[PDB]
Scaffold this active site. Structure first.
Site, short mmCIF file in Angstrom:
data_model
loop_
_atom_site.label_atom_id
_atom_site.label_comp_id
_atom_site.label_asym_id
_atom_site.label_seq_id
_atom_site.Cartn_x
_atom_site.Cartn_y
_atom_site.Cartn_z
N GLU A 220 -14.62 28.65 74.27
CA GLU A 220 -13.46 27.86 74.89
C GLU A 220 -13.14 28.71 76.25
OE1 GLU A 220 -13.07 25.22 73.58
OE2 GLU A 220 -13.80 25.63 71.54
N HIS B 167 -15.69 27.73 79.02
CA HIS B 167 -15.49 26.53 79.51
C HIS B 167 -14.50 26.60 80.68
CE1 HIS B 167 -17.01 23.12 77.18
NE2 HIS B 167 -16.33 23.64 75.99
N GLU C 173 -21.07 20.95 77.53
CA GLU C 173 -21.19 21.33 76.19
C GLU C 173 -22.54 22.12 75.85
OE1 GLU C 173 -18.71 21.71 74.35
OE2 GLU C 173 -17.38 20.28 75.26
N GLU D 171 -9.06 15.44 74.18
CA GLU D 171 -10.56 15.04 74.57
C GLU D 171 -10.84 14.43 73.25
OE1 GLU D 171 -13.28 18.31 74.77
OE2 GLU D 171 -14.83 17.21 75.67
O1 LIG Z 1 -15.33 22.82 68.00
C1 LIG Z 1 -16.26 22.54 68.48
N1 LIG Z 1 -16.59 21.79 69.21
C2 LIG Z 1 -15.33 21.28 70.41
C3 LIG Z 1 -15.54 21.81 71.70
O2 LIG Z 1 -16.77 21.78 72.25
N2 LIG Z 1 -14.67 22.93 72.30
O3 LIG Z 1 -14.74 23.46 73.47
C4 LIG Z 1 -14.86 20.10 70.39
C5 LIG Z 1 -13.61 19.74 70.76
C6 LIG Z 1 -13.16 18.48 70.85
C7 LIG Z 1 -13.75 17.58 69.98
C8 LIG Z 1 -13.11 16.33 70.08
C9 LIG Z 1 -11.85 16.00 69.35
C10 LIG Z 1 -11.07 15.10 68.98
F1 LIG Z 1 -10.05 15.13 68.18
C11 LIG Z 1 -12.07 13.90 69.40
F2 LIG Z 1 -11.21 12.63 69.24
C12 LIG Z 1 -13.06 13.73 70.22
F3 LIG Z 1 -13.48 12.62 70.88
C13 LIG Z 1 -13.52 15.01 70.60
C14 LIG Z 1 -14.97 17.69 69.52
C15 LIG Z 1 -15.67 19.00 69.69
C16 LIG Z 1 -17.78 23.10 67.92
C17 LIG Z 1 -18.81 23.33 68.71
C18 LIG Z 1 -18.36 24.57 69.58
C19 LIG Z 1 -17.97 25.83 68.77
C20 LIG Z 1 -16.93 25.48 67.51
C21 LIG Z 1 -17.22 24.05 66.79
ZN LIG Z 2 -16.94 22.95 74.06
#
Ligand SMILES: O=C(N[C@@H](C(=O)NO)c1ccc(-c2cc(F)c(F)c(F)c2)cc1)C1CCCCC1
Ligand SMILES: [Zn+2]
Ligand SMILES: [Mg+2]
Ligand SMILES: [Mg+2]
Ligand SMILES: [Mg+2]
Length: 889
Positions: A302, A305, A324, A124
């Site tokens: 996670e 999701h 998100e 992602e």
């Molecule tokens: O880790 C986070 N968010 C990720 C997420 O929504 N997981 O379900 C999240 C995952 C991937 C990315 C992400 C990673 C990359 F390497 C990248 F290139 C990109 F464009 C987005 C950004 C945030 C957070 C916000 C949710 C709770 C933990 C801290």
């Molecule tokens: Zn997420």
């Protein structure tokens, strides 16, 4: 630099039905073979076949097993593979390729990369194109058949999505595993992991279908004893989706895997969720308390999701908040239910109104569904996540639980197995709204403005009471300031959860009531109100807005003591503090500007101080809530209310107010610090990782908060308490002993002591780094130089770099040193980091987000460093784009 526009969405002229991968990991390179079974879509107009493919070394490409030749039939420019349309078949065809990639040196941690001795992917948003050629966008849904091969000794555990259907030996000490994942998915949910992983496992039986699900949690061998709480959290997550939403897991197995090097917290790859180790691993001896809520939050996030993002996915990246914002909202419901503490919701609000409100009044302000982007890696913002969560939560506030659940299920049942947009969700919510209103003409069209309009609304109030009529009115106004996204802002659908408190007995005067403000202003009238109430406004923080309650501090105190809603109590306290802060700030500013030899400061309201004492001394009151009331509002919250903020003057203001309150309450603080010890530091369950007591952790938060207040105050002989605290088995306590010892000559003695306790656990040492970084030391620059030389060195681990530098940037007096030396230091770290990890380099820009809110001198100093960063010849796309937007170029 290509700008993508939301309104330009159009389906592809191609279809990819099947992906068959062979990923052969070798010592110095990884060879990826891929066959894509493709077709021509109804939208096709005879265009070139263009694949995304970034940094791939081509060995060969073919169509229908006929090798294509470069120049004649295709071009590749390290970003796009173009196959000229005369060579593209007009019916179903196979495209195949073999490319070479190099995970060992992939320090950007996107695509396929090596984290210590684990090979891991992160796809992602548009990372799959760094692994092989693809039309890399989430509406290109396909089936995946994936084989991974590797050295068996180095990589005995092989994982990808779907069912493991074969395992086999290969000559030369190698081995392979084949994974078939028949359900369609977008490529950003592909993952692969290879390593010498150790695990804990359990079996979960689903509530309704009674399917057995195998749960596995993996880490490197050294840290396998830190996996237990994650497994418990996963079980909890599964039960909560079953119990609240009636949703069961659909697959045979769910794997969670911790890696040391990760750009964010975790990633929801289907059946194979991959985590920053700091958001999956903990143990009571080696983790601070915050780890436990973190792991609960991130495992839950996670897992949720799997419906909101995986089973119902995105049409395009502009819909990011649909998965998100909604998944953060689901995670918040979950964590509130699991912790049973009001501080869970308050912590969310506290983060939103500091970090996200700052973003929304900065040059970076955007709506939760932006109209354009250049960098997807810059798109994952607190606006999209946390304001998105509040927008998703407002549907629940508006509908109530029964109709919310009905609307959510409509959403899931209609879109399961498909891509979706923000409109699809609003549509489901609207159907429930019609049901609740008993009115097929009701609609949520206005509600869509929450997705498109940027900026924080301001909501203000005026009141009227007629004692003879027993009639009370609340007149409400909303206003959003124009910004670069909309010149004219429109009124939003703002739900205002309200109570009316009888000031004579503290009791509720009306039933649960949610005012629906849909105009720029409205007047809500209540009859049979026997006495003039104090209104309790935006209970639970019911909309993401600036609240101007127009209450006196006397009224606010009454709410702080007697209201039923934790957020309004916390907010009333916040508002009393802000009124004081702004007043003293201006008095200090005037003395500075006018060079006064003498002047006066307005003291803190004594009845407010009495109220704080009252709550602190109440045995039946909540320890977490108590820690909030003795804490001034966050600096980043305060800055939204002050133009040309002089950070020195704010530091002087905070110091005066804390000293005013401590001069009255320190004896109370000390008495509580001592009386809380037995319950806060209870060791009964220290060697049970299944047993997590959120109230007890809040008692420690309160004890560590009070100890900080008492240490700063040089409370008589408090150093004795500090030294004894350094001997506690809980890292939250012994790291606190390090930071509060900053004010004593014992600081470096505790620095060495706690370093020795921390150095042999990777994650604990990062927590130690943060503690040092955040220490209130006059020699903090010399200390940071010591961390750089002795501990950090040239680590490319984002956790290491973030730990050393981010806490320091919140040091109001020292990061903002008028020389600009703190700005210079962080810009050097940003530029250095940008060479190998642009996404983390942009994270490290965080302190610059408020640059144009500071006093004129510090604005100039910050802007100079940003312009210096922008002039770096090798600046990344990510960093350039971000700083150009932030500096209004
Ligand atoms: O880790 C986070 N968010 C990720 C997420 O929504 N997981 O379900 C999240 C995952 C991937 C990315 C992400 C990673 C990359 F390497 C990248 F290139 C990109 F464009 C987005 C950004 C945030 C957070 C916000 C949710 C709770 C933990 C801290
Ligand atoms: Zn997420
Ligand atoms: Mg390459
Ligand atoms: Mg159950
Ligand atoms: Mg390391």
């Amino acid at each position: 630099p290509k700008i993508h526009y939301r309104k330009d969405y159009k389906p592809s002229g191609f279809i990819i039905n099947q992906v068959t991968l062979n990923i052969n990991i070798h010592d110095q390179e990884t060879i990826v073979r891929s066959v894509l079974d493709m077709d021509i879509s109804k939208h096709n107009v005879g265009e070139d076949l263009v694949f995304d493919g970034v940094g791939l070394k081509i060995n060969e490409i073919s169509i229908n097993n006929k090798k294509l030749v470069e120049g004649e039939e295709y071009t590749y420019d390290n970003e796009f593979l173009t196959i000229f349309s005369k060579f593209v078949p007009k019916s179903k065809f196979a495209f195949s390729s073999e490319v070479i990639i190099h995970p060992e040196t992939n320090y950007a941690l996107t695509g396929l990369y090596k984290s210590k001795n684990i090979i891991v992917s992160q796809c992602e948003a548009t990372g799959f194109r760094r692994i092989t050629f693809f039309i890399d966008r989430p509406d290109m849904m396909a089936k995946y058949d994936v084989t991974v091969t590797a050295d068996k000794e180095k990589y005995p555990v092989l994982l990808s999505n779907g069912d493991k259907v074969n395992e086999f030996e290969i000559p030369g000490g190698r081995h392979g595993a084949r994974f078939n994942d028949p359900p369609l998915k977008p490529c950003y949910l592909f993952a692969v992991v290879a390593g010498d992983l150790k695990h804990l496992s359990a079996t979960y039986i689903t509530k309704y279908t009674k399917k057995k699900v195998e749960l596995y949690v993996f880490s490197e061998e050294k840290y396998v004893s830190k996996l237990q709480w994650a497994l418990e959290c996963l079980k909890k997550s599964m039960a909560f989706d079953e119990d609240y939403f009636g949703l069961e897991y659909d697959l045979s197995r769910l794997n969670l895997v911790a890696v040391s090097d990760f750009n964010v917290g975790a990633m929801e790859n289907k059946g194979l969720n991959i985590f920053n180790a700091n958001s999956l691993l903990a143990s009571k001896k080696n983790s601070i308390d915050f780890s436990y809520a973190r792991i609960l939050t991130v495992v839950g996030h996670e897992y949720f999701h799997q419906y909101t993002g995986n089973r119902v996915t995105l049409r395009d990246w502009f819909q990011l908040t649909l998965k998100e914002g909604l998944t953060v909202h689901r995670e918040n419901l979950f964590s509130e239910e699991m912790t049973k503490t009001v501080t869970t919701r308050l912590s969310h609000v506290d983060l939103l109104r500091s970090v996200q409100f700052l973003e929304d009044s900065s040059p970076l302000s955007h709506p939760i569904r932006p109209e354009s982007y250049v960098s997807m890696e810059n798109f994952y913002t607190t606006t999209v996540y946390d304001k998105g969560s509040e927008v998703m939560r407002m549907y629940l506030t508006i509908l109530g639980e029964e109709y919310y659940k009905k609307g959510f299920d409509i959403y899931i049942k209609k879109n399961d197995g498909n891509t979706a947009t923000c409109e699809d969700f609003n549509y489901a919510m609207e159907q429930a709204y019609k049901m609740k209103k008993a009115d097929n003409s009701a609609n949520l069209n206005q509600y869509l403005l929450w997705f498109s309009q940027s900026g924080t609304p301001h909501v203000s109030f005026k009141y009227n009471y007629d004692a003879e009529k027993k009639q009370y009115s609340i007149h409400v106004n909303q206003y959003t300031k124009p910004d670069e996204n909309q010149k004219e802002k429109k009124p939003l659908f703002i739900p205002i959860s309200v109570g009316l408190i009888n000031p004579e007995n503290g009791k509720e005067m009306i039933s649960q009531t949610t005012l629906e403000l849909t105009k720029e202003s409205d007047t809500f009238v209540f009859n049979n109100i026997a006495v003039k109430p104090i209104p309790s406004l935006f209970r639970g923080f019911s909309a993401p807005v600036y609240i101007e309650d127009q209450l006196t501090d006397e009224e606010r105190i009454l709410l702080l003591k007697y209201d039923s809603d934790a957020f309004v109590r916390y907010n009333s306290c916040t508002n009393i503090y802000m009124k004081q802060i702004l007043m003293n700030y201006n008095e200090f500013l005037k003395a500075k500007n006018e060079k006064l030899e003498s002047f006066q400061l307005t003291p803190v309201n004594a009845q407010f101080i009495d109220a704080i004492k009252y709550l602190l001394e109440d045995p039946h009151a909540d320890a977490g809530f108590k820690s909030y009331i003795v804490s001034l509002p966050q600096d980043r919250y305060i800055i939204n209310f002050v133009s040309n903020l002089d950070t020195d003057v704010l530091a002087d203001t905070k110091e005066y107010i804390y000293k005013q309150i401590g001069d009255k309450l320190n004896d109370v603080y000390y008495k509580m610090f001592k009386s809380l010890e037995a319950k806060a530091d209870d060791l009964t369950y220290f060697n049970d990782e299944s047993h997590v007591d959120f109230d007890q952790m809040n008692m420690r938060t309160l004890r560590n908060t009070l100890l900080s207040l008492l240490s700063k105050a040089q409370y008589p002989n408090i150093l004795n308490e500090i030294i004894e605290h350094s001997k506690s088995p809980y890292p939250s306590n012994w790291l606190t002993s390090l930071s509060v010892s900053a004010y004593f000559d014992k600081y470096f003695e505790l620095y060495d002591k706690t370093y020795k306790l921390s150095k042999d656990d990777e994650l604990l040492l990062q927590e130690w780094l943060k503690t040092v970084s955040r220490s209130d030391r006059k020699d903090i620059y010399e200390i940071l130089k010591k961390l750089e030389n002795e501990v950090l060195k040239d680590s490319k681990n984002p956790n290491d770099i973030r730990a050393v530098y981010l806490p320091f940037t919140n040091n109001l007096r020292r990061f903002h040193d008028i020389s600009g030396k703190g700005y210079k230091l962080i810009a050097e770290v940003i530029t250095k980091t940008d060479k190998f990890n642009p996404m983390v380099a942009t994270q490290l820009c965080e302190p610059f987000k408020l640059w144009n809110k500071l006093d004129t001198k510090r604005q100039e100093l910050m802007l100079n460093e940003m312009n210096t960063m922008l002039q770096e010849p090798q600046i990344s796309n990510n960093l350039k784009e971000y700083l150009l937007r932030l500096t209004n170029k």
